[PDB]
Design a protein around this ligand. Structure first.
Ligand SMILES: CS(=O)(=O)CCNCc1ccc(-c2ccc3ncnc(Nc4ccc(OCc5cccc(F)c5)c(Cl)c4)c3c2)o1
Ligand SMILES: Nc1ncnc2c1ncn2[C@@H]1O[C@H](COP(=O)(O)OP(=O)(O)OP(=O)(O)O)[C@@H](O)[C@H]1O
Ligand SMILES: Nc1ncnc2c1ncn2[C@@H]1O[C@H](COP(=O)(O)OP(=O)(O)OP(=O)(O)O)[C@@H](O)[C@H]1O
Ligand SMILES: [Mg+2]
Ligand SMILES: [Mg+2]
Length: 1218
């Protein structure tokens, strides 16, 4: 894939003529990672990184010699200034041309003021001036794009070199350095700190060419107009602090909103995650109250910030008019006269200097400050401490030997007890050493000292030969399983097959689609813990080392696989290699030649397994311790009459803007046509002031109305969408993930509230200004309407052609960016394993390859943008040339004022055209959020909360339950769960639910709660459930779920969202559940805040709270789940006795994944794959051996089965025969 930029001329490199094949391919089909162009050798990551590293090392050596801190800024300056001279040269030329061209504009107008048809030398001079103007515009329009591309490429090169240097440092941190630093800070500084280097360079040169341009413009204005230019210059200067101060308030009003936004998002997350609970207990009204209040509070600050932004944009719109008006008011009031030559040069000079002073200089200042901060951060990181390089080893005979003597290290220098106390032992090839003792107190520290991971404070460690190390926690790096096993070294088929067979990885390969070539990312999402541990072992074996180190290799795998591995892959293969093993299982100590015991880092006893057996010490004992989108977006804001009024306001603002300059032209013509007599100053100045005031007011009004209307549309959309999602059936929440649901509330509404209206208003502003420029040009010279049609057609086709590939490249440079961060993070996590083997240059090369692959797409991202901009500027320059030459061709009709107005507007079209196109693309891109929000606004809905037939307030008066031909399915058309359930449940009786796992257990509860619409009839108190509203059905029957959830809020809110109970009743419930004492000790009495999901409360406390809530509700029908699985048996007995003694007079159903505690129920419902088999007294079912209940009881055993039978018999005798 050769780079076409390597074989390009200059007339092809200034027009970007080599990108045509790529654009053609992108138009024909979609582009992939094969289609991108490989980078040039001078842009490879290794070269740039090595260059900057050499310069930085020279600088740090010089600073060390000088006894002073180093300077990354000095290093980058000394590396890049000699290549940044040339771009400064060209930007100087460009600024000179920008300042120069209005002088020739003035010369053309000056010719036109004294038109004489008979003269021809004047016509020739005017043609020459027009040609010079065309040359200046072509310089501004064509070469500037190659200059800009090189300016951007310089920053990209700096960033790539920085990334290489940062990772090279990251691969060699020391232990304390890794401890003090964090795995998140490094990726933070590689994702949000080294990305300011793409933007510091683009606006870098405008720190010295800004004031120079302002000085040149002020001198030119003084030369032409006179003292009056200081009024315009003063307004332009005053515009700087005002704009700066209009940002320090927006920052405050934007950081005030984030609190409400985050609170709303967190509450939304709670609602979405615990949706089943809210729907079951009917708390959606309270949750809607909370969410609505938060949304209103946030929208207040959004409205304030939007009004501020609108006022700022109106100021930007009207600043030029204010400057021109005040300048010329002073110019005329000082006793001078107006001629069309000077006014329309002052206008152009003011436009240029105002743009530069308003935008580019503050942008450059901000970007330079941010880049300075980022350089400081990267320098502070780079100055971290590292390990000392492995020095020249002691001269030995080359034998593979392991020895440690008098070792004593310190993980923390401020700690008291050293990690190791005077260890002294050696091991040789063919010997298997083992280490046992406590639950792991200083277990891996021996391996750390052996590998050099621990700094030896005293003693000596002699290790010779290749080493293989297995981490306690297995680590897998992003790539492929084959590449993970290879670890960068060569691949041999026979060796790989032998390792795979000896590692029992055949089944693991079979379970994967690609076998040994499966692509595995971070954290082993496509694998399992045992598989990645086996991967680690396979890596260690395949590395073919001399010394082998193991640490907890078989704790995360099963028994047979672990035994087979430890036998075949160790006792046979490694019998000729040094081995040191740390294990927790004593069954592997039989094959261990040597066994050592360590307690608290102290040498205790070492020897053979037989000797330790004779010693009488037990190791086990020692181990104990489109368009409709736009229509719907606009309609929700306000009616169509406001749309008409907005159109009128836009047109009035633009018309007044243009009419001010037209009035200046009219004044100039009227003054020129004269004779002393004097023009009436009052009339002209009054009309001028009126037009200026109209421009300002209409601009402000248009901005405010657009902002308010779009913000109101966003608010209405959000309210409708939240009310729609709150009523969706649980099938929707089952089909969608929680993150996806919360995304459309966090990011999409985040766009709609604060970015879409501003982008839309800016686009409308610029489009109207372009339309005004073209309209003035057409009105002055009516024949310009002929080529504008070809220009528009060409522009439309060009926009389609470019955007058919720009979006593809924008996604290509984004899907190839994240692997850099992924590799950095993964290599940081597995740093110890990586450094254990001598293979770190391999990881460095892989990282550099990834960085090259990303620069491969960044290059396309730059060059395609330049390719589009070149053609756009060619079109705009063609328009300017047409105007400037037609004005001279048709000179027999026009006059000085008209020509000056047309020419000045044609000159100002520069830059404005491109900004309009870019903003249109941005708006079209951002409308997808509106599309998604509107899509969520029209979701499904469930049955109405309230029905026409309101129930009498005695509906659960007795508690009769009838199931008649009840069939339930979670999804329409899916497999059936219940088949013809027919049963009757009487009042006050306790009914238990039993069955096998997956046999439709937790389905009758959902059928009773009408979570999904059932098939059949269910009668409660001789009333059908489907004839009553859901809020009249779910409200007054209670359920205790598997795991209770506590929502963030007061305890009063948690136990009574509707505030239907008083303080005395709440305290009575708390003391009846024995939680009153536990509650009345917080700083708050009973309104203390709670963490998410009760993070500070125990599971028993959650069940206690649920029981208290049920008692407070006081429902006649109650259904409990298994509740307890691992809770303290004391708490289990407490809740059992409370359930027995509190709900005697209320119907109780008991579903459970449990036993014995469900033995006292009056009747047992037996479910076989959703079929109701047995429904009768437990004793009667136990009497028959063929009954499934008896077999399920016998599945436990014989003593427990006998106890259960006795309990059932006693319950039957006491109940049925009192
Ligand atoms: C009456 S006026 O002086 O305002 C007319 C000219 N400006 C019109 C206008 C309205 C809004 C903007 C605008 C808003 C935001 C922007 N953000 C970035 N860059 C902008 N423009 C810009 C213009 C010229 C530049 O110099 C290089 C150049 C030279 C010739 C042609 C080009 F396309 C570019 C640069 Cl670097 C940026 C901008 C404008 O411009
Ligand atoms: N990754 C680590 N970073 C810093 N200190 C560590 C690390 N691993 C162990 N240590 C320290 O080494 C010493 C060994 O004690 P500890 O019992 O925690 O070791 P271990 O080998 O990780 O334990 P176990 O075998 O139970 O997993 C302690 O002082 C501990 O803080
Ligand atoms: N939300 C659901 N959507 C689709 N199928 C489901 C859903 N919940 C359960 N199932 C399926 O329905 C069958 C039985 O469901 P159920 O949850 O009642 O079984 P269980 O394991 O006996 O009960 P428990 O939830 O008490 O463990 C199983 O095949 C299960 O996979
Ligand atoms: Mg350990
Ligand atoms: Mg289940």
């Amino acid at each position: 894939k050769p780079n076409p930029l390597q074989d390009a001329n200059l007339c092809s490199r200034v027009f970007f003529w080599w990108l045509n094949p790529l654009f053609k391919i992108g138009h024909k089909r979609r582009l992939e990672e094969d289609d991108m162009y490989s980078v040039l050798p001078e842009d490879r990551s290794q070269h740039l990184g090595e260059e900057l590293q050499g310069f930085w090392d020279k600088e740090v050596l010089r600073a060390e010699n000088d006894a002073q801190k180093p300077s990354l800024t000095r290093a980058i300056i000394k590396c890049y200034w000699k290549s940044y001279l040339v771009l400064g040269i060209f930007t100087l030329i460009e600024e000179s041309a920008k300042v120069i061209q209005p002088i020739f504009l003035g010369k053309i107008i000056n010719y036109f003021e004294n038109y004489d048809p008979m003269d021809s030398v004047a016509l020739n001079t005017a043609y020459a001036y027009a040609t010079v103007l065309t040359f200046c515009t072509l310089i501004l329009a064509i070469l500037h794009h190659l200059y800009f591309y090189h300016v951007q490429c310089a920053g990209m090169r700096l960033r790539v070199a920085m990334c290489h240097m940062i990772y090279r440092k990251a691969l060699r941190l020391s232990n304390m350095a890794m401890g003090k630093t964090t795995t998140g800070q490094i990726v933070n500084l590689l994702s949000n700190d080294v990305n300011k280097f793409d933007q510091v360079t683009v606006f870098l040169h405008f720190l010295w060419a800004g004031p120079l341009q302002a000085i040149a413009v002020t001198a030119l204005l003084w030369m032409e107009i006179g003292i009056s230019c200081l009024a315009g210059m003063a307004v332009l200067i005053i515009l700087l602090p005002l704009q700066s101060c209009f940002g320090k308030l927006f920052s405050s009003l934007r950081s005030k909103t984030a609190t409400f936004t985050d609170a709303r998002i967190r509450t939304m997350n709670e609602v979405i995650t615990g949706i089943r609970i809210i729907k079951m207990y009917a708390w959606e009204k309270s949750f809607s109250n909370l969410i609505t209040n938060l949304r209103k509070k946030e929208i207040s600050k959004i409205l304030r910030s939007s009004c501020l932004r609108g006022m700022n944009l109106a100021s930007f719109f009207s600043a030029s008019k204010i400057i021109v008006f005040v300048t010329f008011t002073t110019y005329v009031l000082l006793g001078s006269v107006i001629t069309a030559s000077r006014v329309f040069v002052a206008v152009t000079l003011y436009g240029a200097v105002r743009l530069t002073v308003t935008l580019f200089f503050p942008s450059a200042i901000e970007r330079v400050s941010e880049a300075i901060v980022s350089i400081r951060r990267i320098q502070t990181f780079l100055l971290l401490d590292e390990i000392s390089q492995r020095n020249r080893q002691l001269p030995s005979d080359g034998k593979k030997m392991v020895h440690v003597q008098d070792f004593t290290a310190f993980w923390d220098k401020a700690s008291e007890t050293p990690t190791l106390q005077g260890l002294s032992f050696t091991v040789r090839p063919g010997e298997l050493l083992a280490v046992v003792g406590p639950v792991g107190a200083g277990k891996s520290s021996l391996l750390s000292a052996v590998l050099g991971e621990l700094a030896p404070s005293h003693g000596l460690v002699s290790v010779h030969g290749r080493i293989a190390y297995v981490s306690q926690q297995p680590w897998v790096f992003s790539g492929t399983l084959r590449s993970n096993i290879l670890f960068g070294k060569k691949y041999e088929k026979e060796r790989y097959e032998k390792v795979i067979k000896a590692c029992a990885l055949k089944k693991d390969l079979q379970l994967l689609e690609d076998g040994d070539l499966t692509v595995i990312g971070d954290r082993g999402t496509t694998l399992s813990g045992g598989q990645k541990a086996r991967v680690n072992l396979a890596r260690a074996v395949y590395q073919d080392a001399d010394i082998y180190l193991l640490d907890d290799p078989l704790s995360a795998v099963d028994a047979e696989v672990s035994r087979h591995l430890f036998e075949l892959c160790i006792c046979q293969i490694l019998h000729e290699k040094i081995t040191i093993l740390v294990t927790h299982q004593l069954q592997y100590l039989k094959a261990a030649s040597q066994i050592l015991i360590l307690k608290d880092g102290k040498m205790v006893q070492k020897g053979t397994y037989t000797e330790f057996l004779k010693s009488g010490i037990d190791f086990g004992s020692l181990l104990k311790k489109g368009f409709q989108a736009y229509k719907n977006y606009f309609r929700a804001g306000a009616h169509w009459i406001v749309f008409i009024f907005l159109i009128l306001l836009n047109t009035a603002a633009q018309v007044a803007y243009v009419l001010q300059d037209w009035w200046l032209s009219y004044w100039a013509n009227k003054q020129s046509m004269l004779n002393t007599e004097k023009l009436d100053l009052n009339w002209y100045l009054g009309i001028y002031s009126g037009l200026t005031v109209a421009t300002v007011l209409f601009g402000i009004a248009r901005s405010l109305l657009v902002f308010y209307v779009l913000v109101n549309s966003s608010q209405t959309l959000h309210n409708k969408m939240f009310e729609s999602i709150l009523k969706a059936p649980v099938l929707f929440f089952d089909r969608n993930p929680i993150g996806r649901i919360l995304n459309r509330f966090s990011k999409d509404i985040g766009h709609l509230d604060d970015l879409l209206p501003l982008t839309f208003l800016d686009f409308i502003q610029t489009l109207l200004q372009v339309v005004g420029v073209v309209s003035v040009a057409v009105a002055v010279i009516p024949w310009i309407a002929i080529p504008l049609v070809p220009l528009g057609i060409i522009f439309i086709f060009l926009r389609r052609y470019f955007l058919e590939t720009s979006r593809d490249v924008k996604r290509l440079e984004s899907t190839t960016r994240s692997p850099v961060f992924s590799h950095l993070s993964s290599s940081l996590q597995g740093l110890w394993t990586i450094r254990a083997y001598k293979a770190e240059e391999r990881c460095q090369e892989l990282f550099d390859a990834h960085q090259d692959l990303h620069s491969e797409a960044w290059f396309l991202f730059l060059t395609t943008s330049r390719w589009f901009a070149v053609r756009l500027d060619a079109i705009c320059a063609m328009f300017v040339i047409i105007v400037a030459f037609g004005s001279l061709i048709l000179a027999k009709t026009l006059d000085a004022g008209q020509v000056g107005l047309a020419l000045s507007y044609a000159l100002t079209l520069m830059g404005m055209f491109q900004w309009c196109v870019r903003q249109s693309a941005e708006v079209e891109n951002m409308m997808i959020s509106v599309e998604r929000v509107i899509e969520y606004t029209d979701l499904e809905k469930e049955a109405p909360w309230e029905y026409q037939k309101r129930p009498p307030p005695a509906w659960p008066h007795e508690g009769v339950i009838i199931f008649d031909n009840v069939n339930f399915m979670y999804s329409p058309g899916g497999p059936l769960v219940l088949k013809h359930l027919t049963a009757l449940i009487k009042s006050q009786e306790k009914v238990g639910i039993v069955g096998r796992t997956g046999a439709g257990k937790s389905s009758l509860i959902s059928a009773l709660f009408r979570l999904s619409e059932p098939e059949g009839k269910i009668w409660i108190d001789k009333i059908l459930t489907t004839e009553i509203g859901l809020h009249d059905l779910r409200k007054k029957m209670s359920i205790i779920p598997q795991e209770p959830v506590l929502f963030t809020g007061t305890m009063r809110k948690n136990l009574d969202p509707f505030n239907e109970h008083t303080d005395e009743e709440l305290w009575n419930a708390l003391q009846e559940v024995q939680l009153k004492e536990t509650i009345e000790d917080l700083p708050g009495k009973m309104d203390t805040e709670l963490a998410e999901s009760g993070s500070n409360f125990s599971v028993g406390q959650r069940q206690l709270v649920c029981l208290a809530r049920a008692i407070l509700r006081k429902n006649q029908i109650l259904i409990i789940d298994q509740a307890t699985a691992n809770v303290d048996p004391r708490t289990d007995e407490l809740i059992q006795k409370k359930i027995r003694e509190k709900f005697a007079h209320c119907t109780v159903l008991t579903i459970a994944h449990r036993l014995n505690t469900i033995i006292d129920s009056d009747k047992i419902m037996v479910l076989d794959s959703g079929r109701l088999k047995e429904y009768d007294e437990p004793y009667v079912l136990l009497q028959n051996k063929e009954s499934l209940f008896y077999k399920m009881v016998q599945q436990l055993g014989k003593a427990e089965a006998a106890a259960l039978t006795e309990t059932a018999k006693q319950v039957y005798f006491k109940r049925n025969y009192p």
